Amino acid sequence: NANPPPPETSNPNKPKRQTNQLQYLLRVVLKTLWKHQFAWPFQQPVDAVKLNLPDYYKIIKTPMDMGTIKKRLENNYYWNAQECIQDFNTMFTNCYIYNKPGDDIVLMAEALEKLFLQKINELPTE
Ligand SMILES: CNC(=O)c1cccc(-c2ccc3c(c2)N(C(=O)c2ccco2)C[C@H](C)N3C(C)=O)c1
């Protein structure tokens, strides 16, 4: 069972805009979560071949990771801030869906989600 390709991260046909909200998502939210001690498993797609998890992509049909989110922001892939926020939410919930409650990786994602919510609290107005 091969890994799927990573989510798309750049599309020259998508329109581009700079907004206060998207700038904040890259410069504050993503940068803060990226440097966190628990960020490392989330910095690239789950490599289920390397990890011998043949049911990962049978269970998780909407993968997402922070490496993808970073690339999407840098490539002006998102038009609405909510698209980015949804991707963060998908990342965290994928981790809760697949892994056992109480596992280290779950507590890691929970800490990262709490930080994310503290950072999103101060998102600029639309
Ligand atoms: C560059 N490679 C890595 O950063 C890397 C190396 C070894 C393992 C991992 C890793 C990546 C993703 C995950 C886990 C481990 N997982 C772990 O259980 C785990 C335990 C402790 C840290 O990660 C399995 C699970 C599928 N998972 C997530 C994000 O849900 C990532």
Side-chain angles (χ1 to χ4, degrees):
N1 311 8
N3 293 319
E8 281 297 301
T9 57
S10 75
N11 187 329
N13 293 335
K14 284 182 176 288
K16 292 181 212 287
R17 63 178 185 174
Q18 176 190 132
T19 70
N20 294 155
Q21 294 189 315
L22 290 167
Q23 290 186 287
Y24 183 84
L25 285 162
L26 183 54
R27 291 172 188 272
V28 176
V29 180
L30 189 282
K31 183 192 188 76
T32 294
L33 261 66
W34 192 278
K35 67 182 189 195
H36 193 279
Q37 67 152 351
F38 289 163
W40 64 272
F42 301 100
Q43 288 172 342
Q44 60 285 308
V46 169
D47 190 332
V49 178
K50 264 159 166 263
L51 292 167
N52 189 22
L53 303 172
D55 71 333
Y56 185 86
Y57 289 111
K58 311 215 291 196
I59 286 171
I60 301 299
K61 305 266 84 152
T62 315
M64 185 55 51
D65 63 280
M66 291 206 307
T68 295
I69 293 168
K70 183 181 171 285
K71 290 167 199 180
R72 288 175 166 198
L73 289 158
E74 300 161 333
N75 293 325
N76 311 297
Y77 189 82
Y78 301 123
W79 182 259
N80 293 317
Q82 183 53 217
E83 299 177 81
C84 178
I85 295 163
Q86 176 188 307
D87 280 352
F88 272 110
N89 286 310
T90 294
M91 181 182 83
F92 298 131
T93 56
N94 286 345
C95 183
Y96 306 155
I97 294 166
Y98 184 79
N99 298 286
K100 297 200 246 152
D103 281 342
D104 58 354
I105 186 61
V106 171
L107 294 186
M108 292 167 80
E110 293 178 342
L112 287 169
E113 180 185 17
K114 276 145 168 260
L115 179 56
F116 164 76
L117 292 175
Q118 290 310 311
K119 295 288 83 164
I120 286 306
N121 187 43
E122 300 175 71
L123 185 79
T125 278
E126 203 190 341

PDB file of all heavy atoms in Angstrom, residues 40-47 50-51 53 56 94-95 98-99 103-105 108, ligand 1:
ATOM      1  N   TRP A  40       7.404  18.283  15.582  1.00  0.00           N
ATOM      2  CA  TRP A  40       8.105  17.433  14.614  1.00  0.00           C
ATOM      3  C   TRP A  40       7.268  16.333  13.881  1.00  0.00           C
ATOM      4  O   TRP A  40       7.421  16.206  12.649  1.00  0.00           O
ATOM      5  CB  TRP A  40       9.422  16.877  15.215  1.00  0.00           C
ATOM      6  CG  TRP A  40       9.223  15.946  16.411  1.00  0.00           C
ATOM      7  CD1 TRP A  40       9.137  16.298  17.731  1.00  0.00           C
ATOM      8  CD2 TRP A  40       9.147  14.523  16.375  1.00  0.00           C
ATOM      9  NE1 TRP A  40       8.975  15.181  18.513  1.00  0.00           N
ATOM     10  CE2 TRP A  40       8.977  14.078  17.707  1.00  0.00           C
ATOM     11  CE3 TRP A  40       9.193  13.577  15.350  1.00  0.00           C
ATOM     12  CZ2 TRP A  40       8.870  12.726  18.037  1.00  0.00           C
ATOM     13  CZ3 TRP A  40       9.076  12.214  15.685  1.00  0.00           C
ATOM     14  CH2 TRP A  40       8.914  11.814  17.017  1.00  0.00           C
ATOM     15  N   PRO A  41       6.337  15.600  14.579  1.00  0.00           N
ATOM     16  CA  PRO A  41       5.625  14.563  13.804  1.00  0.00           C
ATOM     17  C   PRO A  41       4.660  15.136  12.789  1.00  0.00           C
ATOM     18  O   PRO A  41       4.192  14.409  11.906  1.00  0.00           O
ATOM     19  CB  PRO A  41       4.822  13.800  14.879  1.00  0.00           C
ATOM     20  CG  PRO A  41       5.534  14.079  16.160  1.00  0.00           C
ATOM     21  CD  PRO A  41       5.951  15.530  16.003  1.00  0.00           C
ATOM     22  N   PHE A  42       4.380  16.426  12.925  1.00  0.00           N
ATOM     23  CA  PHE A  42       3.337  17.096  12.156  1.00  0.00           C
ATOM     24  C   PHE A  42       3.943  17.982  11.063  1.00  0.00           C
ATOM     25  O   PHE A  42       3.213  18.705  10.378  1.00  0.00           O
ATOM     26  CB  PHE A  42       2.467  17.958  13.098  1.00  0.00           C
ATOM     27  CG  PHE A  42       1.808  17.168  14.179  1.00  0.00           C
ATOM     28  CD1 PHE A  42       2.346  17.147  15.452  1.00  0.00           C
ATOM     29  CD2 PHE A  42       0.651  16.425  13.915  1.00  0.00           C
ATOM     30  CE1 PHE A  42       1.762  16.384  16.462  1.00  0.00           C
ATOM     31  CE2 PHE A  42       0.049  15.669  14.900  1.00  0.00           C
ATOM     32  CZ  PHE A  42       0.606  15.633  16.184  1.00  0.00           C
ATOM     33  N   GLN A  43       5.265  17.955  10.913  1.00  0.00           N
ATOM     34  CA  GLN A  43       5.938  18.866   9.987  1.00  0.00           C
ATOM     35  C   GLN A  43       5.946  18.363   8.545  1.00  0.00           C
ATOM     36  O   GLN A  43       6.433  19.051   7.626  1.00  0.00           O
ATOM     37  CB  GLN A  43       7.347  19.188  10.488  1.00  0.00           C
ATOM     38  CG  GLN A  43       7.331  20.122  11.716  1.00  0.00           C
ATOM     39  CD  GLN A  43       8.716  20.315  12.351  1.00  0.00           C
ATOM     40  OE1 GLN A  43       9.625  19.535  12.113  1.00  0.00           O
ATOM     41  NE2 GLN A  43       8.879  21.364  13.163  1.00  0.00           N
ATOM     42  N   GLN A  44       5.468  17.134   8.360  1.00  0.00           N
ATOM     43  CA  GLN A  44       5.385  16.532   7.011  1.00  0.00           C
ATOM     44  C   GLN A  44       4.294  15.466   7.053  1.00  0.00           C
ATOM     45  O   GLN A  44       3.839  15.083   8.153  1.00  0.00           O
ATOM     46  CB  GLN A  44       6.733  15.905   6.613  1.00  0.00           C
ATOM     47  CG  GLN A  44       7.226  14.792   7.539  1.00  0.00           C
ATOM     48  CD  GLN A  44       7.777  15.325   8.859  1.00  0.00           C
ATOM     49  OE1 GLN A  44       8.639  16.224   8.868  1.00  0.00           O
ATOM     50  NE2 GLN A  44       7.299  14.782   9.973  1.00  0.00           N
ATOM     51  N   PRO A  45       3.853  14.985   5.874  1.00  0.00           N
ATOM     52  CA  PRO A  45       2.807  13.968   5.871  1.00  0.00           C
ATOM     53  C   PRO A  45       3.200  12.728   6.679  1.00  0.00           C
ATOM     54  O   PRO A  45       4.395  12.389   6.762  1.00  0.00           O
ATOM     55  CB  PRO A  45       2.653  13.638   4.374  1.00  0.00           C
ATOM     56  CG  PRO A  45       2.995  14.931   3.703  1.00  0.00           C
ATOM     57  CD  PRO A  45       4.153  15.459   4.509  1.00  0.00           C
ATOM     58  N   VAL A  46       2.196  12.058   7.246  1.00  0.00           N
ATOM     59  CA  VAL A  46       2.396  10.755   7.881  1.00  0.00           C
ATOM     60  C   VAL A  46       2.907   9.799   6.807  1.00  0.00           C
ATOM     61  O   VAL A  46       2.240   9.571   5.772  1.00  0.00           O
ATOM     62  CB  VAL A  46       1.094  10.229   8.511  1.00  0.00           C
ATOM     63  CG1 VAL A  46       1.242   8.761   8.923  1.00  0.00           C
ATOM     64  CG2 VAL A  46       0.696  11.078   9.706  1.00  0.00           C
ATOM     65  N   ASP A  47       4.124   9.306   7.020  1.00  0.00           N
ATOM     66  CA  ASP A  47       4.701   8.307   6.116  1.00  0.00           C
ATOM     67  C   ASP A  47       4.343   6.921   6.644  1.00  0.00           C
ATOM     68  O   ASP A  47       5.079   6.328   7.433  1.00  0.00           O
ATOM     69  CB  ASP A  47       6.213   8.510   5.946  1.00  0.00           C
ATOM     70  CG  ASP A  47       6.806   7.634   4.833  1.00  0.00           C
ATOM     71  OD1 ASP A  47       6.244   6.541   4.558  1.00  0.00           O
ATOM     72  OD2 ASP A  47       7.836   8.042   4.263  1.00  0.00           O
ATOM     73  N   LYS A  50       6.928   3.948   5.873  1.00  0.00           N
ATOM     74  CA  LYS A  50       8.023   3.957   6.842  1.00  0.00           C
ATOM     75  C   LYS A  50       7.570   3.507   8.226  1.00  0.00           C
ATOM     76  O   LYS A  50       8.294   2.806   8.905  1.00  0.00           O
ATOM     77  CB  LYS A  50       8.662   5.340   6.970  1.00  0.00           C
ATOM     78  CG  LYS A  50       9.911   5.582   6.134  1.00  0.00           C
ATOM     79  CD  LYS A  50      10.102   7.077   5.950  1.00  0.00           C
ATOM     80  CE  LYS A  50      11.475   7.454   5.433  1.00  0.00           C
ATOM     81  NZ  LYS A  50      12.369   7.849   6.555  1.00  0.00           N
ATOM     82  N   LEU A  51       6.374   3.914   8.646  1.00  0.00           N
ATOM     83  CA  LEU A  51       5.911   3.593  10.008  1.00  0.00           C
ATOM     84  C   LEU A  51       5.190   2.241  10.118  1.00  0.00           C
ATOM     85  O   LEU A  51       4.707   1.875  11.198  1.00  0.00           O
ATOM     86  CB  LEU A  51       4.996   4.711  10.517  1.00  0.00           C
ATOM     87  CG  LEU A  51       5.572   6.095  10.806  1.00  0.00           C
ATOM     88  CD1 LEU A  51       4.402   7.054  10.981  1.00  0.00           C
ATOM     89  CD2 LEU A  51       6.478   6.117  12.039  1.00  0.00           C
ATOM     90  N   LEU A  53       2.189   1.381   8.967  1.00  0.00           N
ATOM     91  CA  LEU A  53       0.803   1.624   9.338  1.00  0.00           C
ATOM     92  C   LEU A  53      -0.093   1.490   8.111  1.00  0.00           C
ATOM     93  O   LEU A  53      -0.647   2.473   7.642  1.00  0.00           O
ATOM     94  CB  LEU A  53       0.639   3.034   9.932  1.00  0.00           C
ATOM     95  CG  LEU A  53       1.495   3.389  11.148  1.00  0.00           C
ATOM     96  CD1 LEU A  53       1.327   4.868  11.466  1.00  0.00           C
ATOM     97  CD2 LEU A  53       1.092   2.552  12.343  1.00  0.00           C
ATOM     98  N   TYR A  56      -3.420   3.385   7.956  1.00  0.00           N
ATOM     99  CA  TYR A  56      -3.506   4.829   8.217  1.00  0.00           C
ATOM    100  C   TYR A  56      -4.351   5.538   7.157  1.00  0.00           C
ATOM    101  O   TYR A  56      -5.276   6.301   7.471  1.00  0.00           O
ATOM    102  CB  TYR A  56      -2.126   5.507   8.338  1.00  0.00           C
ATOM    103  CG  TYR A  56      -2.282   6.966   8.726  1.00  0.00           C
ATOM    104  CD1 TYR A  56      -2.399   7.339  10.057  1.00  0.00           C
ATOM    105  CD2 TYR A  56      -2.376   7.977   7.756  1.00  0.00           C
ATOM    106  CE1 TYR A  56      -2.569   8.679  10.425  1.00  0.00           C
ATOM    107  CE2 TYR A  56      -2.566   9.308   8.120  1.00  0.00           C
ATOM    108  CZ  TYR A  56      -2.652   9.654   9.453  1.00  0.00           C
ATOM    109  OH  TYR A  56      -2.836  10.975   9.821  1.00  0.00           O
ATOM    110  N   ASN A  94      -7.427  14.398  12.658  1.00  0.00           N
ATOM    111  CA  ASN A  94      -6.843  13.143  12.111  1.00  0.00           C
ATOM    112  C   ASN A  94      -6.037  12.388  13.180  1.00  0.00           C
ATOM    113  O   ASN A  94      -6.097  11.168  13.282  1.00  0.00           O
ATOM    114  CB  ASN A  94      -5.917  13.436  10.934  1.00  0.00           C
ATOM    115  CG  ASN A  94      -6.665  13.803   9.672  1.00  0.00           C
ATOM    116  OD1 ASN A  94      -7.873  13.587   9.548  1.00  0.00           O
ATOM    117  ND2 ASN A  94      -5.942  14.384   8.727  1.00  0.00           N
ATOM    118  N   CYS A  95      -5.299  13.142  13.989  1.00  0.00           N
ATOM    119  CA  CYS A  95      -4.444  12.547  14.991  1.00  0.00           C
ATOM    120  C   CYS A  95      -5.287  11.883  16.087  1.00  0.00           C
ATOM    121  O   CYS A  95      -4.971  10.787  16.530  1.00  0.00           O
ATOM    122  CB  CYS A  95      -3.503  13.614  15.552  1.00  0.00           C
ATOM    123  SG  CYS A  95      -2.334  12.947  16.749  1.00  0.00           S
ATOM    124  N   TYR A  98      -7.058   8.593  14.450  1.00  0.00           N
ATOM    125  CA  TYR A  98      -6.229   7.425  14.205  1.00  0.00           C
ATOM    126  C   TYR A  98      -5.610   6.809  15.467  1.00  0.00           C
ATOM    127  O   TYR A  98      -5.623   5.571  15.639  1.00  0.00           O
ATOM    128  CB  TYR A  98      -5.134   7.711  13.166  1.00  0.00           C
ATOM    129  CG  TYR A  98      -4.379   6.453  12.868  1.00  0.00           C
ATOM    130  CD1 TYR A  98      -4.904   5.491  12.001  1.00  0.00           C
ATOM    131  CD2 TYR A  98      -3.153   6.201  13.472  1.00  0.00           C
ATOM    132  CE1 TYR A  98      -4.224   4.304  11.749  1.00  0.00           C
ATOM    133  CE2 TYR A  98      -2.478   5.018  13.244  1.00  0.00           C
ATOM    134  CZ  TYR A  98      -3.009   4.079  12.368  1.00  0.00           C
ATOM    135  OH  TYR A  98      -2.300   2.913  12.140  1.00  0.00           O
ATOM    136  N   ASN A  99      -5.058   7.663  16.325  1.00  0.00           N
ATOM    137  CA  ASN A  99      -4.260   7.227  17.478  1.00  0.00           C
ATOM    138  C   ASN A  99      -5.114   7.001  18.708  1.00  0.00           C
ATOM    139  O   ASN A  99      -6.257   7.473  18.764  1.00  0.00           O
ATOM    140  CB  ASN A  99      -3.169   8.246  17.764  1.00  0.00           C
ATOM    141  CG  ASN A  99      -2.215   8.391  16.603  1.00  0.00           C
ATOM    142  OD1 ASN A  99      -1.370   7.513  16.360  1.00  0.00           O
ATOM    143  ND2 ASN A  99      -2.324   9.508  15.882  1.00  0.00           N
ATOM    144  N   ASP A 103      -2.366   8.192  24.119  1.00  0.00           N
ATOM    145  CA  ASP A 103      -1.047   7.983  23.489  1.00  0.00           C
ATOM    146  C   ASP A 103      -0.301   9.304  23.541  1.00  0.00           C
ATOM    147  O   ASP A 103      -0.925  10.382  23.467  1.00  0.00           O
ATOM    148  CB  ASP A 103      -1.145   7.626  21.988  1.00  0.00           C
ATOM    149  CG  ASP A 103      -1.504   6.179  21.725  1.00  0.00           C
ATOM    150  OD1 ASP A 103      -1.360   5.334  22.642  1.00  0.00           O
ATOM    151  OD2 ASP A 103      -1.882   5.883  20.553  1.00  0.00           O
ATOM    152  N   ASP A 104       1.028   9.222  23.617  1.00  0.00           N
ATOM    153  CA  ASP A 104       1.861  10.425  23.559  1.00  0.00           C
ATOM    154  C   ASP A 104       1.510  11.364  22.399  1.00  0.00           C
ATOM    155  O   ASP A 104       1.402  12.583  22.585  1.00  0.00           O
ATOM    156  CB  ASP A 104       3.370  10.071  23.554  1.00  0.00           C
ATOM    157  CG  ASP A 104       3.799   9.153  22.384  1.00  0.00           C
ATOM    158  OD1 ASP A 104       2.950   8.649  21.589  1.00  0.00           O
ATOM    159  OD2 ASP A 104       5.038   8.950  22.256  1.00  0.00           O
ATOM    160  N   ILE A 105       1.314  10.802  21.212  1.00  0.00           N
ATOM    161  CA  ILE A 105       1.095  11.628  20.026  1.00  0.00           C
ATOM    162  C   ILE A 105      -0.233  12.393  20.179  1.00  0.00           C
ATOM    163  O   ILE A 105      -0.349  13.515  19.709  1.00  0.00           O
ATOM    164  CB  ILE A 105       1.174  10.811  18.705  1.00  0.00           C
ATOM    165  CG1 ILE A 105       1.079  11.716  17.471  1.00  0.00           C
ATOM    166  CG2 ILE A 105       0.112   9.709  18.640  1.00  0.00           C
ATOM    167  CD1 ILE A 105       2.214  12.733  17.421  1.00  0.00           C
ATOM    168  N   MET A 108       0.425  15.228  22.513  1.00  0.00           N
ATOM    169  CA  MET A 108       1.182  16.195  21.728  1.00  0.00           C
ATOM    170  C   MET A 108       0.260  17.057  20.874  1.00  0.00           C
ATOM    171  O   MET A 108       0.370  18.296  20.885  1.00  0.00           O
ATOM    172  CB  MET A 108       2.255  15.503  20.883  1.00  0.00           C
ATOM    173  CG  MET A 108       3.381  14.892  21.709  1.00  0.00           C
ATOM    174  SD  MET A 108       4.373  13.804  20.671  1.00  0.00           S
ATOM    175  CE  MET A 108       5.406  14.997  19.836  1.00  0.00           C
TER     176      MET A 108
HETATM  177  C1  LIG B   1      11.337  13.191   9.675  1.00  0.00           C
HETATM  178  N1  LIG B   1      10.587  12.093  10.336  1.00  0.00           N
HETATM  179  C2  LIG B   1       9.814  12.395  11.385  1.00  0.00           C
HETATM  180  O1  LIG B   1       9.689  13.545  11.799  1.00  0.00           O
HETATM  181  C3  LIG B   1       9.178  11.309  12.025  1.00  0.00           C
HETATM  182  C4  LIG B   1       9.970  10.231  12.441  1.00  0.00           C
HETATM  183  C5  LIG B   1       9.408   9.137  13.113  1.00  0.00           C
HETATM  184  C6  LIG B   1       8.021   9.123  13.354  1.00  0.00           C
HETATM  185  C7  LIG B   1       7.203  10.204  12.979  1.00  0.00           C
HETATM  186  C8  LIG B   1       5.806  10.155  13.210  1.00  0.00           C
HETATM  187  C9  LIG B   1       4.933  10.872  12.382  1.00  0.00           C
HETATM  188  C10 LIG B   1       3.542  10.837  12.534  1.00  0.00           C
HETATM  189  C11 LIG B   1       2.976  10.075  13.573  1.00  0.00           C
HETATM  190  C12 LIG B   1       3.823   9.363  14.424  1.00  0.00           C
HETATM  191  C13 LIG B   1       5.215   9.364  14.217  1.00  0.00           C
HETATM  192  N2  LIG B   1       3.213   8.572  15.363  1.00  0.00           N
HETATM  193  C14 LIG B   1       3.507   8.373  16.679  1.00  0.00           C
HETATM  194  O2  LIG B   1       2.882   7.496  17.289  1.00  0.00           O
HETATM  195  C15 LIG B   1       4.323   9.140  17.417  1.00  0.00           C
HETATM  196  C16 LIG B   1       4.662   8.873  18.684  1.00  0.00           C
HETATM  197  C17 LIG B   1       5.439   9.853  19.144  1.00  0.00           C
HETATM  198  C18 LIG B   1       5.614  10.760  18.178  1.00  0.00           C
HETATM  199  O3  LIG B   1       4.894  10.330  17.048  1.00  0.00           O
HETATM  200  C19 LIG B   1       2.195   7.677  14.728  1.00  0.00           C
HETATM  201  C20 LIG B   1       1.090   8.589  14.133  1.00  0.00           C
HETATM  202  C21 LIG B   1       0.430   7.948  12.898  1.00  0.00           C
HETATM  203  N3  LIG B   1       1.638   9.969  13.805  1.00  0.00           N
HETATM  204  C22 LIG B   1       0.744  10.990  13.790  1.00  0.00           C
HETATM  205  C23 LIG B   1       1.240  12.432  13.484  1.00  0.00           C
HETATM  206  O4  LIG B   1      -0.451  10.806  14.006  1.00  0.00           O
HETATM  207  C24 LIG B   1       7.796  11.291  12.304  1.00  0.00           C
END
